């Protein structure tokens, strides 16, 4: 009955918000990630790192506020408040981009905290930890997109900024520079996400429309008792309906619910792998056989060549403003343009 | 267009001519499919976490369920007790019918909006 | 000729596409919203050029 | 002196169908990139 | 089209090798 055993008893006391040992990592970091985002989007500029306004105080709205990435000249600096760039000056820290690494790093450890919480709670209640295992895909996405991707590039500047419109800019950057829609790892991610939404909707609708009449009411929600032993819908009727509608159907409820875990989790993992490749500019940008043909045959045109022309427009029209540290000066005459527009 | 690269062309031109990323109905569609994928993983992992022991370790746990059996193969009370503690008690469903209606409604409504 | 400007886009595997780049191409902008069944075309060759399969599909 | 740790392995027909579908769709996906 | 000549064998083995694996396991499940 040492102090460790006593601290363990209090941490694991059953209260309204469970704490646990994992809480000591989780709660400070999550609160500070949250808090830093709300603080930066309300009060802090991106004027000296990006040449942009980015806070409510500057007149942005919920879609255009952001905690933006540090200037490219910071490289991959941790940007510690007490470090060589800000030298303990909080104001300068905000101006140089320190809230971005602040949120990214506290957020990283908060995510670790949350996964640890899933393990800790599962162990105490006596359930298998498949929910912790499922949470590895969001962690893979976050680590690959916010950390690995900028670490392979020139600086933190090219990571996603934390904001709605800033993430849309990120989307479009990845189209015009990486041809990311053409990447089979993203295609697998897309299939996993849309397949997960498909399964979500089809399983809920199927259960809602094969319920047993276990009550007299027209609202069927009151006819379920969480301690009842009986299945609340008919697996047998659901199976026959889908076999005759679609040709096949689930027959094993365990495989069904495992499959629901597997599909979106695997999708996010695949997309994470493609982003790691993009950290190094290892894109699936081109098809060589199409380029060889197209270069030789001015009559050969496909949707592949049409999209490259869009990518080229994106790159040249957005780069000067998007990468102000490069000092791109593009005269009008060099900008690619079709007729009239 | 009826094609993989053709679809992407359609999306890119759509953005240039309508700023669809900045349209709330598309933002609702993304919440719909992201959230759909989230809740798919959650429901799958929660029911899988609370499967009742019915098999040894040298066989698939899927054989713990027999097609047509009357009893449930997982302990929803245990899943609630886990998930209630992961967030807080009332952020968690204990009514399987309410839970499954939520699974149907969320992605359907979101895809309605983006359509 | 998807855009109606006599600039045909090659969409099929035999004409130099792969799985990722191939498509059934939308029907010509010259047609607009007009109905273009096979029997409105002077020939199948005309129908193919102007993207008749897309409407039928 | 047989080894007691040996076990039979199984793959039911549905798993065969699932797995064959995965391999074939993956092939159909990546083949364009292998040909480049 | 000037495609990679090794693309055919990569695709062919990519299909055949894992497929044959699954067939082997399935047929011996059925005969026992």
């Amino acid at each position: 009955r040492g102090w460790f055993d006593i601290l363990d008893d209090w941490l694991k006391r059953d209260r309204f918000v469970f704490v646990g040992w994992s809480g000591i990592l989780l709660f400070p970091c999550a609160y500070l990630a949250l808090g830093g985002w709300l603080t930066g989007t309300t009060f802090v500029t991106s004027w000296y790192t990006h040449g942009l306004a980015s806070s409510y105080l500057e007149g942005c709205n919920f879609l255009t506020v952001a905690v933006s990435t540090p200037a490219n000249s910071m490289g991959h600096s941790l940007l510690l408040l007490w470090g060589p760039e800000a030298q303990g000056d909080f104001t300068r820290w905000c101006q140089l981009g320190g809230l971005w690494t602040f949120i990214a790093l506290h957020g990283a450890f908060g995510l670790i905290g949350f996964m640890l919480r899933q393990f800790e709670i599962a162990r105490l209640v006596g359930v298998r930890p498949y929910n912790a295992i499922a949470f590895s895909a969001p962690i893979a996405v976050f680590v690959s997109v916010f950390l690995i991707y900028p670490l392979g590039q020139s600086s933190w500047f090219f990571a996603p900024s934390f904001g709605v419109a800033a993430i849309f800019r990120f989307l479009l950057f990845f189209q015009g520079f990486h041809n990311w829609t053409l990447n089979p790892f993203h295609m697998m991610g897309v299939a996993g996400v849309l397949g997960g939404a498909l399964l979500c909707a089809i399983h809920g609708a199927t259960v809602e429309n094969t319920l047993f009449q276990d009550g007299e009411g027209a609202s069927t929600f009151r006819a379920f008792n969480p301690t009842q032993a009986e299945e609340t819908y008919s697996m047998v009727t659901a199976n026959r309906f889908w076999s005759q509608i679609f040709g096949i159907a689930f027959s094993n409820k365990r495989w069904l619910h495992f499959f629901m875990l597997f599909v979106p989790v695997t999708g996010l993992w695949m997309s994470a792998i493609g982003v790691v490749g993009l950290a190094l500019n290892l894109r699936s940008y081109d098809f060589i056989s199409q380029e060889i043909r197209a270069a030789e045959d001015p009559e050969f045109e496909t949707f592949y060549t049409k999209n490259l022309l869009l990518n080229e427009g994106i790159r040249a029209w957005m780069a000067p403003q998007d990468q102000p540290h490069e000092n791109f000066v593009f005269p009008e005459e060099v900008l690619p343009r079709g007729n009239a527009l | 267009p009826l094609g993989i690269s053709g679809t992407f062309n359609f999306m890119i031109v759509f953005q240039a001519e309508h700023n669809i990323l900045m349209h709330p109905f598309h933002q609702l569609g993304v919440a719909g499919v992201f959230g759909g994928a989230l809740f798919c993983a959650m429901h799958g992992s929660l029911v899988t976490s609370s499967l009742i022991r019915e098999t040894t370790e040298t066989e698939s746990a899927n054989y713990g369920y027999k097609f047509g059996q009357e009893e449930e193969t997982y302990n929803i009370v245990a899943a609630h007790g886990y998930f209630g503690r992961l967030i807080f008690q009332y952020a968690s469903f204990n009514n399987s019918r309410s839970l499954h209606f939520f699974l149907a409604a969320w992605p359907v409504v979101g895809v309605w909006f983006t359509a | 000729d998807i855009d109606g400007i006599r600039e045909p886009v090659s969409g099929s595997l035999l004409y130099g596409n792969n799985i990722i780049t191939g498509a059934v191409v939308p029907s010509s902008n010259a047609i607009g919203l007009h109905f273009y069944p096979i029997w409105e075309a002077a020939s199948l060759d005309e129908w193919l050029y102007n993207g008749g399969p897309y409407q039928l599909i | 002196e047989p080894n007691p740790n040996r076990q039979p392995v199984e793959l039911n027909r549905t798993s065969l169908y699932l797995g064959l579908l995965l391999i074939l769709v993956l092939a159909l996906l990546f083949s364009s990139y292998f040909f480049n | 089209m000037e495609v990679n000549q090794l693309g055919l064998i990569a695709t062919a083995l990519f299909v055949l090798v894992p497929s044959v694996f699954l067939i082997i396991l399935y047929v011996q499940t059925e005969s026992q």
Binding site: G247, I248 | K66 | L13, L14 | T14, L21 | -
Partner: peptide
């Protein structure tokens, strides 16, 4: 050869659909 490969793989998938539907393990109520 690449056209033939794409079409071959697609055709194998359609054959798999046929067996997966009409020659499934029948679901048995037991």
């Amino acid at each position: 050869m690449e056209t033939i490969t794409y079409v071959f793989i697609f055709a194998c998938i359609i054959a798999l659909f046929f067996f997966a539907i009409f020659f499934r393990e029948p679901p048995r109520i037991t």
